DNA sequence: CGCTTATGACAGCCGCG
DNA sequence: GCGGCTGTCATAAGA
């Protein structure tokens, strides 16, 4: 067993560490670590240490971490750089584990848990923990068990014990259907009072103290709630036992006009699964509730139940407990699929950081680079403060709103990381500047070649080509590592246990590598990264902005020569690292007529791209490279999509309403020829969570009908949809939104100045519902359905909004399902955005429409 | 907690016999 | 009575 750390904390002058020893047992140790920092010295000083600029450095070994930290402030007062890794935990980590870390996840306690708190009033604020915790389910990855803590008697009810037998039975049989996979893994524990429950849980927590602590929202609700409850009841020093080092800090987050507080538990790494998912999932969702996600990921959600959750414990304690358990299990089932915790461990051990830092691109890269330079006696720059100045970013072409029959799209691979390597952008690489011509001049090889000596970016920056930059070297290394591991995955498929084993469990390294790669430019633009430099960040994006436009010229010119046309605009759209070309003239040179079926032309274009364009492109970028005199040429484009209408149909190809707003009928993607064509829709309301369900549906149909079938097909559907609108379920045709800053406009239960339309709706609901505690209340920052109300309604206003995902209290319903203004609803959510589609694609959604309402 | 480039729904203020 | 606009909110799409 090669040792490896579990958690590291610096608690003034001493480092507290939890680690797995050479025998796989968990041990903990206190170390009075002595760090070393560095200062520039004269050349007379003989040293093995140099900064990234080659300047000699003296190594200063401190008595304790306090001394070190003192010297830094004292060094800041003087005016001289204080070189070295200032986050000692990392340094200490790098010293105690200088070698590749191999971890046995098996020996790492990973706890996943959830809490239940019956509350008669509103949501039980974790900062105050006013109500009893009547249920806790805590799964421990080591024992592979679900430990359940049931509160039998509470100010809110005295209930019977929970039943496994029943829990396992079908819903038909009155059971909870707790999966059989876990049924024999549940360990049940009923308590007579909360104090017993809490104190028993706390001792359990000491025996099976978590290393990694996750669950769904455990960081904003469960952990603070447990901490505060135990604290309010017993002493504060009892709550602290929740920390293996008995130290905890109250951290206050104030993001997005809010202000919440979490509890830092020294000696534990919290990875709230809802955050891991938001990060490493890369799939923006209209909701992040455990149910929605669970459904999306596993095809089933949280246990279902009747009545208000706050009434569930009395009414159905049996389900209540089972619901608690199923919630813990749902999370595990997602991780059993996405392996995010596992992905977090790989990363943390690859960079040698606290696993929690997997949430910070900066901390991660700083650590990766820090160890890379240590290994070669180099000293990292001191972190510097930097005014936050916004620099120009990605380039985006204004498209001519229109229909586009045939379209091929191309992508640049890892543009930004490529740009760093190709130009060699890094702090200790800046070699100077050059008079800057206007960007377009560069995009057209008209401006004077910036240099004969240095690598250049259009923003006037010049870099050395001889030496190797720290940043570029570091990504390249990762790029290589990615190709290494995904090189094993290639042959790791030729007793398939000695072929598949790591073939997939190993490949996931390919993943993290990719994650570092795509997060480097992010760090570089962050003023808190010790390698940030405004000039460089700007050099990276400006070069990219030149890239896309220079290649647009090249692709334009080529197709024009090839097609015997001149001045014709082929590149119809460009977005940061990709272009979309119109292939009409290329389809014509052959004549749509000469094609067997659709797959025929989809094949023609594929070849044409791979055979005639790709090389003109690589030719073009190579020229650009000689122009900027770059270190090397990493500017590689790929044919992405091939789109067009089904051969023989009257469907337009696709269309563009504006920037980031378009739709295509794609038949091929990077090579994969789909069986049926797929709609690629970007920015249209069909892709918006605020668009009423039924409507995003009919809008998607409308788009499809437009692309694949003709205009006639579209009009038929439209007519039908109006004709049938009033017959749709109201939950389906009601728009949705988020209720933020309700009271900010709540003036006596009425709308103040600038009151947003939906917030106003909320208030109308509020007033028609004031006096009832038997009516689902409109919480803050939540989500609300919104419906327009016909003129002269009893709610006294144009609209109303109630809590989403739910029906509407029979108090106001019927009256709502009577005054809702279908007309206004249809127009606002369906007809107008469609009209935006049609006007752009040059189509009508209603026969005969004076072609003139398109002028002025 | 760990972002520029952009579009669309509303609100309200502005000349305008 | 409303186009042209500046401004608050919402939600994207890829990092």
UniProtKB/Swiss-Prot annotation:
Provenance organism: Escherichia phage RB69 (Bacteriophage RB69)
SMART domains assigned: POLBc (SM00486)
Residues given in the record as Mg(2+) 1 binding sites: 114, 116, 327
Protein name: DNA-directed DNA polymerase
Chain residues that bind Mg(2+) 4: 411-412, 577
HAMAP family: DPOL_T4
Keyword Magnesium: yes
UniProt-annotated stretches for the region Interaction with the polymerase clamp: 851-856
Result after altering residue 415 to M: No effect on base selectivity
Signal peptide: none
Region (Polymerase): 380-856
Nuclease is among the record's keywords: yes
Segments of this protein annotated with the region Binding of DNA in B-conformation: 659-662
Assembly behavior: Part of the replicase complex that includes the DNA polymerase, the polymerase clamp, the clamp loader complex, the single-stranded DNA binding protein, and the primase/helicase. Interacts with the polymerase clamp; this interaction constitutes the polymerase holoenzyme.
Region named Beta hairpin: 248-264
Record's catalysed reaction(s): DNA(n) + a 2'-deoxyribonucleoside 5'-triphosphate = DNA(n+1) + diphosphate
Residues that coordinate or bind Mg(2+) 2: 222, 327
Family, similarity comment: Belongs to the DNA polymerase type-B family.
Region described as 3'-5'exonuclease: spans on this chain: 103-340
Pfam family, one: DNA_pol_B_exo1
Role noted for this protein: Replicates the viral genomic DNA. This polymerase possesses two enzymatic activities: DNA synthesis (polymerase) and an exonucleolytic activity that degrades single-stranded DNA in the 3'- to 5'-direction for proofreading purpose.
């Amino acid at each position: 067993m090669k040792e490896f750390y579990l958690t590291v904390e610096q608690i003034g002058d001493s480092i507290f560490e939890r680690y797995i020893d050479s025998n796989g047992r968990e041990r903990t140790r206190e170390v009075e670590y002595k760090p070393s920092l560095f200062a520039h010295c004269p050349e007379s000083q003989a040293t093995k240490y140099f900064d990234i600029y080659g300047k000699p450095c003296t190594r200063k070994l401190f008595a304790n971490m306090r001394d070190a930290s003192q010297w830094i402030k004292r060094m800041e007062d003087i005016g001289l750089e204080a070189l070295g890794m200032d986050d000692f935990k990392l340094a200490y980590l790098s010293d105690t584990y200088n070698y590749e870390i191999k971890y046995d996840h098996t020996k790492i306690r990973v706890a996943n848990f959830d809490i239940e708190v019956t509350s008669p009033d509103g949501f039980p604020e974790p900062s105050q923990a006013k109500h009893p915790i009547d249920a806790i389910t805590h799964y421990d990855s080591i024992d592979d068990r679900f430990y359940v803590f049931d509160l039998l008697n509470s100010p809110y009810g005295n209930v019977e014990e929970w039943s496994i037998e029943i829990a396992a039975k079908l819903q038909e049989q009155g059971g909870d259907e707790v999966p059989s996979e876990i049924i024999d893994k549940i360990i049940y524990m009923p308590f007579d009072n909360e104090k017993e429950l809490l104190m028993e849980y706390l001792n359990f927590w000491q025996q099976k103290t978590p290393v990694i602590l996750t669950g769904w929202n455990v960081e904003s609700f469960a952990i603070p709630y447990v901490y505060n409850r135990i604290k309010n009841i017993f002493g504060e020093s009892t709550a602290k036992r929740l920390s293996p080092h008995r130290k905890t800090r109250v951290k206050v987050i104030e993001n997005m006009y809010g202000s919440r507080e979490i509890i830092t538990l020294f000696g534990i790494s919290v990875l709230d699964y809802i955050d891991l998912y938001k990060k490493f999932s890369f799939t923006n969702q209209p909701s992040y509730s455990l149910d929605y996600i669970s459904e999306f990921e596993l095809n089933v959600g949280k246990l279902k139940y009747d009545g208000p959750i706050s009434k569930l414990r009395e009414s159905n304690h049996q389900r209540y407990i089972s619901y608690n358990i199923i919630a813990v299990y749902r999370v595990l089932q997602i991780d059993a699929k996405r392996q995010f915790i596992n992905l977090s461990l790989d990363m943390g051990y690859y960079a040698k950081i606290q696993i929690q830092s997997v949430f910070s691109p900066i901390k991660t890269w700083d650590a990766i680079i820090f160890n890379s330079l240590k290994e070669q006696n180099k000293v990292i720059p001191q972190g510097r403060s930097h005014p936050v100045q916004p620099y120009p970013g990605a380039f985006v072409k204004e498209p001519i709103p229109n229909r586009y029959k045939y379209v091929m799209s191309f992508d640049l691979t890892s543009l930004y990381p490529s740009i760093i390597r190709q130009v060699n952008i890094s702090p200790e690489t800046i070699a100077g500047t050059f008079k800057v011509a206007p960007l377009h001049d560069y995009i057209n090889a008209v401006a004077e070649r910036p240099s004969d000596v240095y690598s250049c970016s259009p923003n006037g920056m010049m870099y050395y080509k001889d030496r190797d930059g720290v940043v570029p070297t570091e990504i390249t290394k990762v790029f290589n590592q990615r190709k290494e591991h995904k090189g094993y995955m290639l042959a790791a498929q030729r007793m398939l246990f000695r072929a598949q084993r790591t073939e997939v469990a190993g490949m996931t390294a390919q993943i993290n590598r990719k994650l570092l790669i795509n997060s480097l430019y992010g760090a570089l633009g962050n003023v808190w990264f010790r390698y940030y430099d405004l000039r460089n960040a700007t050099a990276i994006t400006t070069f990219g902005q030149m890239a896309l436009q220079w290649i647009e010229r090249k692709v334009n010119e080529y197709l024009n020569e090839v097609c015997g046309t001149e001045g014709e605009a082929f590149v119809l759209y460009g977005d940061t690292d990709s272009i979309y070309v119109s292939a009409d003239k290329i389809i014509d040179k052959v004549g749509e007529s000469k094609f067997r079926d659709t797959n025929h032309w989809v094949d023609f274009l594929d070849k044409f791209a791979r055979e005639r364009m790709e090389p003109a492109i690589d030719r073009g970028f190579r020229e650009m490279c000689e122009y900027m005199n770059n270190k090397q040429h990493l500017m590689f484009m790929d044919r992405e999509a091939i789109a067009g209408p089904p051969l023989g149909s009257k469907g337009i190809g696709g269309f563009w309403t504006g920037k980031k707003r378009y739709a295509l009928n794609v038949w091929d993607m990077e090579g994969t020829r789909y069986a049926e064509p797929k709609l690629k829709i970007m920015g249209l309301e069909t892709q918006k969570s605020s668009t009423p369900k039924a409507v995003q549906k009919a809008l998607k149909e409308c788009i499809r009908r437009m692309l694949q079938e003709g205009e006639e097909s579209l009009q038929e559907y439209f007519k039908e949809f109006e004709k049938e609108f009033r017959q749709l379920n109201y939950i389906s045709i009601a728009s949705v939104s988020s209720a933020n800053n309700i009271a900010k406009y709540d003036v006596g239960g009425f709308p103040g100045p600038k009151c947003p339309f939906h917030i106003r709706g909320i208030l109308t609901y509020n007033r028609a519902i004031k006096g009832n505690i038997d009516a689902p209340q409109v919480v803050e920052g939540e989500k609300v359905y919104v419906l327009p109300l016909r003129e002269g309604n009893p709610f006294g206003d144009k609209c109303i909004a109630w809590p989403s995902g739910t029906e509407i209290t029979d108090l106001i319903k019927d009256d709502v399902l009577h005054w809702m203004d279908y007309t206004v609803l249809l127009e606002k959510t369906f007809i107008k955005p469609l009209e935006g589609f049609t006007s752009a694609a040059k189509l009508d959604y209603e026969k005969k429409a004076s072609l003139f309402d398109m002028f002025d």
